[PDB]
Amino acid sequence: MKKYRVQPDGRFELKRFDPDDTSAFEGGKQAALEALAVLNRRLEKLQELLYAEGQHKVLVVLQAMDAGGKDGTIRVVFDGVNPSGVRVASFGVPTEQELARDYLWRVHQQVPRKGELVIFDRSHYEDVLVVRVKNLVPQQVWQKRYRHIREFERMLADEGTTILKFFLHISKDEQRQRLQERLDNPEKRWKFRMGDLEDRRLWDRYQEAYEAAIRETSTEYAPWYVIPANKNWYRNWLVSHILVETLEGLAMQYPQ
Amino acid sequence: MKKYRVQPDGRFELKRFDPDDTSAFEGGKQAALEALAVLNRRLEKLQELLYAEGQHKVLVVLQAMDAGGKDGTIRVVFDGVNPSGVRVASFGVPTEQELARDYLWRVHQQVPRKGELVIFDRSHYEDVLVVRVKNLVPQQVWQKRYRHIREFERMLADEGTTILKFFLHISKDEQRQRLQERLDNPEKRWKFDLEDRRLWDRYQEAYEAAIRETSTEYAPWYVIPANKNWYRNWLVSHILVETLEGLAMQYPQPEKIVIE
Amino acid sequence: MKKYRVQPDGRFELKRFDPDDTSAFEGGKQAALEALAVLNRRLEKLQELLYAEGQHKVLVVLQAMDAGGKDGTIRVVFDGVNPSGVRVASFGVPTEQELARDYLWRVHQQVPRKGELVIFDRSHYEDVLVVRVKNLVPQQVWQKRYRHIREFERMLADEGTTILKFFLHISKDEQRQRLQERLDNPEKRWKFRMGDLEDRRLWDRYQEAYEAAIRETSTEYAPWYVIPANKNWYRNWLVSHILVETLEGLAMQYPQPE
Amino acid sequence: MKKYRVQPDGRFELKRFDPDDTSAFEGGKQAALEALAVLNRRLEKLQELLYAEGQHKVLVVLQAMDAGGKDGTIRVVFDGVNPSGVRVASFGVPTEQELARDYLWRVHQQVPRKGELVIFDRSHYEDVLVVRVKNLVPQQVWQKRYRHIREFERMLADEGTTILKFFLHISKDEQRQRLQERLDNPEKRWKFMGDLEDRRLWDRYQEAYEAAIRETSTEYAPWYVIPANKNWYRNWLVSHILVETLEGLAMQYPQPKIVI
């Protein structure tokens, strides 16, 4: 709601958030899945209002550690929404043609148009996290990218884009459970490859990067939301709540 | 159930198909929504296998008269499917940058990649219908486009693309009901043209000719009676799930570890 | 030659520039055609060095009034340059697909990659000129675009893009001659559209827009250059001089393998 | 003039053309550089006619062995032409996002628009050469793309694209000097171990080019073999055939008293 919105004052500290926290919903899994169902219908009717009006642009950014629940959020929260009005843009490791330009070049290509909702499955923030943790570029160049993102997102917002960025917060031990479970599942053993366990060895470094990126790039036009994602039912409900409330705030109407 | 697949013999005539025909499903309406639901979940797990394997490409082409059920088919049949594995490419009237190249230029861009299922809301067949119906180009230039489409689809199929093209068949009277409902629907007045209705019979000759020419083995055409939304949604789901299971996809290999 | 660089002090005024000024070249048209040839040869060897090194990005922005000489600058200055290393990106009136996103969306797509030199035949500055003069958007929204351009260009510069922006300055009277000459040329009337005369009627409004745009967006990382373009020989020479000396300033080197 | 166009009869054999042939021009190295200059200038105003008319599309395909002179052809033949009307599309080794679709996906994106001349520095023919020589795909699957390209090029041509395809032919001995010359040039070594592996497979690249040219040579998209052992002769012949082809299109300036 407003507990998880980080304000643009440069005071954000990541240790003030617990991945197992569930204090916003006065209930358990069975009670939230009832609130998730009613929220999902409101999201479906809001998205058809967004597509019909065709004036607003909605950009949902999902960033999290590996197995943090990015795909789970996309699959569950946007169940039933019209496929012609929502699209997922995934930003993996860059190609040679994409590294030949600025890091914002490939991301700007996928910005939502009018009447469209685009979910960034990993976004331009990958260029201030994995590139910072593994030292793929000097510290001098990515220390300046904090200002580029603030101004790039400001340009989007001033031109009619509503920006929501969610950080799915999971604990270090919970990742050890999900990665071990992903290996012991035939139908999920394929997503994991042994190149994703050294990233876990740099757990503390990715958390300092996420703390700094959120402390710097969270603005009023593009706010950051920290989502405790140790409980899938609570993560799916809280992301659904914040997203639906912001869409109704736009006061959109069907064209006459 | 493959009575609705038209075979590559050049002897196809559309009037043999009745939009109200429902002879493939034994039962009524509500009985089909229970068979559709199990097909829908079979489709969801097949698509996750398509995304996981990452070797096949699935292209679903939807062409139909206006209000024929293209938007209804996409929303209902693909309800619940993972958005990261399915994408809708809508092809309206082309822009000046799209007319500067061939008509296949804008269509080829949206072709599915590996592990992806793409639904063509309209497709390259619009360049063998409206340009033929309204005589926007000479007959000599679009007559050759039957061969271009056959060979463009052959190139896709031979390079690992599974092509399914569904023509949602509705009657002329049923369209008059659906379009008038659009005017009397508060949430649907915005999508809504005398010229498309006035040229109904010509559009039927164009769709019949396009299907007669471009229906091949690697890219077959399916005629779907869409006068009853419940029957069209079940049959397209049946043909799609059957072709997806025909590809016999399997999960990839990881190539035990304690994480610690 | 530093007279034509407008400084980042927010007090640039276009009145102190004369389109007929030629004080940087101590000679005439014939003497400049010999200096242009020597500059053109240096540009050819510099562009192949840019392509060979493959690390720098060079973006040349050309903005000017109608018939101000943008196409003349592209053709003459880049005569002989290898087509594999230079590309022209023209930005006309936007499409509905291009208007569905931000105004910088279509411009960012054409940004040069490493080892490439891209000429913007009109650029994102059209969204603070023709959109400002003709009020295609409210004044509240495009006043914010001065900050977007400064920060978008800083993002490009910090990521390895060398930006050169040239404003070809022609007088109102000289444009009257070139537009009438365009009508009396069999091979050039096609360029003339009947909608080019309302812009001619808004001459002063376009000059206030260009003055404000240059005053706001001229920075140390993306500077503006005012080029007196009433004389094609002086316009072609001066743009060639600033471009060659800026490319040589990068001190690029050939990659030696092994 | 016409001795170098291979006719669409499926008969072409590459050993009939030798890179040292210079039988089409009467004169030496000094006489052709003036004939190249007059052809080059006429090309400059012909391209301005192509851009002004804005109705034709011109596609020039350049394929050749390594160091065969493709970049030299681009640099010299198109020296002075307005950059706003001609564009070079280079097709190197494919990326992952480009391999997820068909091999024609990335090339079809760069096809010339109306009023544009596009130079393909390498093209879709690399997908019937380097993948065939190095066995990146089974022999049965690339046997069919000969048919894909023939029909893809017809689709372009029938929709207003004038296609010119040039194969710059150099001998095995001439390449050995240029690769050693590139090694002994301070300003040119960067272009050069990955290039010497192709020299180990010289003959199989020549058989691949022979099959690709013999199969894909059509009356709508013809192949031209250019002896490129002599740079002065190679640069002149492509300029002659291309300028004659542009004048063959018979383009003219468009049509509209106003005073300011």
Q: What are C's interface residues with D at a Cβ cutoff of 8 A?
A: 52, 71, 74-75, 78-84, 86-88, 90, 119, 121, 176, 179-180, 183, 186-187, 189-190, 197, 200, 254-257
**Pair A84, A44: CB distance under 8 Å:** no
Give contacts of D109 with chain B, Cβ < 8 Å: 105, 108-109
**Pair B179, B66: CB distance under 8 Å:** yes
Give the CA angle between residues B232, B235, B239 to the nearest 5°: 140
Q: Which residues contact residue C13 at a Cβ distance below 8 angstroms, ignoring those fewer than 6 apart?
A: C211, C215
Provide the number of CB pairs (under 8 Å) joining chain A to chain B: 73
Helix (H) or strand (E) holding B117: strand B117-121
Query: Closest approach of chain A CAs to the CA of C72, in angstroms?
Result: 28
CA atoms of A206 and A208, how far apart (whole Å): 6
Question: Both tokens of residue B138?
Answer: 């000479």
Give contacts of D118 with chain C, Cβ < 8 Å: none
Cross-chain Cβ contact A144/C152 below 8 Å: no
Tell me the residue ranges of DSSP E strands in D33-110. 57-64, 86-90
Cross-chain Cβ contact A88/B90 below 8 Å: no
Task: Please give the DSSP secondary-structure letter assigned to residue A196.
Answer: G
**Chain B nearest-CA residue for A176:** B259
CA atoms of B85 and B51, how far apart (whole Å): 6
Cross-chain Cβ contact C105/A97 below 8 Å: no
Helices (H) and strands (E) in chain B, counts: 11, 6
Query: Closest approach of chain C CAs to the CA of A128, in angstroms?
Result: 14
Cross-chain Cβ contact B96/C96 below 8 Å: no
Helix (H, G, I), strand (E, B) or coil at A247: helix
- One DSSP character per residue, chain C reads -GGGBPPSSS---GGG--TT--TTSSS-HHHHHHHHHHHHHHHHHHHHHHHHH---EEEEEEEESTTSSHHHHHHHHTTT--TTTEEEEE--SPPHHHHTS-HHHHHHHT---TTEEEEEES-GGGGGTHHHHTTSS-HHHHTTHHHHHHHHHHHHHHTTEEEEEEEEE--HHHHHHHHHHHHT-TTTGGG--TTHHHHHHTHHHHHHHHHHHHHHH--SSS-EEEEE-SSHHHHHHHHHHHHHHHHHHT--------
Q: Buried b / exposed e across B154-179, counting CB within 10 Å, b at 16+?
A: bbbbbbebbbbbbbbbbeeebbeebb
Task: Please give the DSSP secondary-structure letter assigned to residue D18.
Answer: -
CA atoms of A144 and A162, how far apart (whole Å): 24
Segments in D60-217 forming alpha helices (H): 70-77, 96-99, 103-108, 130-133, 139-142, 145-158, 172-183, 196-199, 202-216
Q: Which residue is listed with tokens 């697949």?
A: B5
CB atoms inside a 10 Å sphere around CB B18: 12
Give contacts of D96 with chain A, Cβ < 8 Å: 95
Q: Which residue is listed with tokens 């596609």?
A: D59
Query: Closest approach of chain B CAs to the CA of C95, in angstroms?
Result: 8
Q: What length does chain B have?
A: 260
CA atoms of C29 and C69, how far apart (whole Å): 16
Question: Both tokens of residue A31?
Answer: 């009670």
Q: Which residues contact residue D139 at a Cβ distance below 8 angstroms, ignoring those fewer than 6 apart?
A: D132
**Pair B146, B215: CB distance under 8 Å:** no
Going D132 to D136 to D142 to D145, the CA torsion angle's sign is negative
CA atoms of C80 and B231, how far apart (whole Å): 66
| Long-range contacts of A170-174, Cβ-Cβ distance < 8 Å, separation of 24 or more | A170/A19, A170/A64, A170/A65, A170/A67, A170/A68, A170/A69, A170/A229, A170/A230, A171/A19, A171/A20, A171/A230, A172/A203, A174/A19, A174/A230
Cross-chain Cβ contact C152/A156 below 8 Å: no
CA atoms of C189 and C67, how far apart (whole Å): 12
Check which CATH number belongs to the domain holding A256 and give it: 3.40.50.300
Query: Closest approach of chain B CAs to the CA of A143, in angstroms?
Result: 32
CA atoms of B129 and B51, how far apart (whole Å): 34
Q: Which residues contact residue B127 at a Cβ distance below 8 angstroms, ignoring those fewer than 6 apart?
A: B103, B142, B145
Give the CA angle between residues C249, C254, C258 to the nearest 5°: 150
CA atoms of D65 and D206, how far apart (whole Å): 9
Provide the number of CB pairs (under 8 Å) joining chain A to chain D: 5
**Pair A192, B254: CB distance under 8 Å:** yes
Give the HSE-up count for residue B119: Cα atoms under 13 Å, Cβ half-sphere: 26
Q: Which residue is listed with tokens 């365009």?
A: C182
**Chain A nearest-CA residue for C138:** A159
Question: Both tokens of residue A113?
Answer: 């148009």
CB-CB: which of B78, B84, B252 is closest to A71?
B84
Tell me the CA end-to-end span of chain B in Å, nearest whole number: 54
Q: How large is the greatest C-alpha to C-alpha distance in chain D, in angstroms?
A: 69
For residue B28, count CB atoms less than 10 angstroms from its CB and return exposed for 0-12, middle for 13-18, buried for 19 or more.
exposed
Give contacts of B100 with chain D, Cβ < 8 Å: 113-114, 116
Give contacts of C176 with chain D, Cβ < 8 Å: 260
Q: Which residue is listed with tokens 């030696």?
A: C256
CB-CB: which of C87, C180, C186 is closest to D87?
C87
Number of domains in chain C: 1
Question: Both tokens of residue C243?
Answer: 């471009």
Give the C-alpha distances (Å, rounded to integers) separating D12 from B146, D7, D145, D210, D211: 30, 8, 19, 7, 9
The strand pair at D5-6 and D223-227 is best described as antiparallel
Helix (H, G, I), strand (E, B) or coil at D57: strand
Task: Please give the DSSP secondary-structure letter assigned to residue D126.
Answer: G
Question: Both tokens of residue C235?
Answer: 């316009």
Main-chain dihedrals φ then ψ at residue D64, nearest 5 degrees: -170, 160
Q: How determined?
A: X-ray
CA atoms of D134 and D125, how far apart (whole Å): 14
CA atoms of D6 and D210, how far apart (whole Å): 11
CA atoms of C67 and C196, how far apart (whole Å): 10
**Pair A60, A119: CB distance under 8 Å:** yes
Segments in chain B forming alpha helices (H): 29-53, 70-77, 96-99, 103-109, 130-133, 139-143, 145-158, 172-183, 194-198, 200-214, 229-246
**Pair B128, B146: CB distance under 8 Å:** yes
CB-CB: which of D100, D108, D114 is closest to B108?
D108
**Chain A nearest-CA residue for C145:** A155
Segments in A184-231 forming alpha helices (H): 198-201, 203-217
Q: What length does chain C have?
A: 258
**Chain A nearest-CA residue for B255:** A193
Q: Which amino acid is at A11?
A: R
- Chain centroid offset of residue A53 CA: 25
CA atoms of A84 and A90, how far apart (whole Å): 17
Beta bridge partners of A120: A61, A89
Give contacts of C95 with chain B, Cβ < 8 Å: 95-97
**Pair D148, D104: CB distance under 8 Å:** yes
Give the C-alpha distances (Å, rounded to integers) separating B244 from B58, B71, B156: 8, 22, 17
Q: Which residues contact residue A110 at a Cβ distance below 8 angstroms, ignoring those fewer than 6 apart?
A: A89, A91, A118, A120
The resolution in Å comes to: 2.9
CA atoms of C58 and C112, how far apart (whole Å): 7
CB-CB: which of D101, D141, D154 is closest to B113?
D101
Q: Which residues contact residue C125 at a Cβ distance below 8 angstroms, ignoring those fewer than 6 apart?
A: C61, C63, C149, C213, C217
CA atoms of D3 and D224, how far apart (whole Å): 9
Give the C-alpha distances (Å, rounded to integers) separating B238 from A162, B35, B241: 39, 9, 5
Task: Please give the DSSP secondary-structure letter assigned to residue B124.
Answer: G
Checking chain B for breaks where C and the next N are over 2.5 Å apart, the residues before them are 192, 255
CA atoms of B144 and B136, how far apart (whole Å): 15
CA-based radius of gyration for chain B = 19
Cross-chain Cβ contact D141/B158 below 8 Å: yes
CB atoms inside a 10 Å sphere around CB A94: 16
CA atoms of C40 and C36, how far apart (whole Å): 6
CA atoms of D149 and D214, how far apart (whole Å): 13
**Chain B nearest-CA residue for D106:** B109
CB-CB: which of B79, B83, B187 is closest to A74?
B83
Cross-chain Cβ contact B88/A84 below 8 Å: yes
CA atoms of B71 and B74, how far apart (whole Å): 5
Q: Which residues contact residue C21 at a Cβ distance below 8 angstroms, ignoring those fewer than 6 apart?
A: C228
Question: Both tokens of residue D27?
Answer: 């004169």
Segments in chain A forming alpha helices (H): 29-53, 70-77, 96-99, 103-108, 130-133, 139-142, 145-158, 172-183, 198-201, 203-217, 232-249
Closest CA to C129 of C93, C156, C154: C93
Domain residues for the domain of A252 are 1-256
The strand pair at D161-169 and D57-64 is best described as parallel
Which chains does C contact via 3+ CB–CB distances below 8 A? A, B, D
**Pair B215, B221: CB distance under 8 Å:** yes
CA atoms of A205 and A194, how far apart (whole Å): 19
CA atoms of B64 and B248, how far apart (whole Å): 30
Q: Which amino acid is at B21?
A: D
Task: Please give the DSSP secondary-structure letter assigned to residue B153.
Answer: H
The strand pair at C116-121 and C86-90 is best described as parallel
Give contacts of A153 with chain C, Cβ < 8 Å: none
Give the CA angle between residues D159, D161, D165 to the nearest 5°: 140
Question: Both tokens of residue A6?
Answer: 């980080």
Q: How large is the greatest C-alpha to C-alpha distance in chain A, in angstroms?
A: 57
Provide the number of CB pairs (under 8 Å) joining chain C to chain D: 68
Give the C-alpha distances (Å, rounded to integers) separating D41 from B139, D36, D80, D253: 39, 9, 8, 18
The strand pair at D57-64 and D86-90 is best described as unpaired
CA atoms of C246 and C240, how far apart (whole Å): 10
Query: Closest approach of chain A CAs to the CA of C89, in angstroms?
Result: 16
Give contacts of D97 with chain B, Cβ < 8 Å: 113
**Chain C nearest-CA residue for A144:** C158
Cross-chain Cβ contact C179/D260 below 8 Å: yes
Give the CA angle between residues A202, A168, A74 to the nearest 5°: 120
Beta bridge partners of B167: B63, B223
Cross-chain Cβ contact D96/A96 below 8 Å: no
Candidates C75, C113, C175, partner chain D, best to mutate (most D CBs within 10 A)? C75
CA atoms of D122 and D89, how far apart (whole Å): 8
Q: What length does chain D have?
A: 260
Query: Closest approach of chain D CAs to the CA of B118, in angstroms?
Result: 12
Question: Both tokens of residue D191?
Answer: 């272009």
**Chain A nearest-CA residue for B90:** A84
Task: Please give the DSSP secondary-structure letter assigned to residue A5.
Answer: B
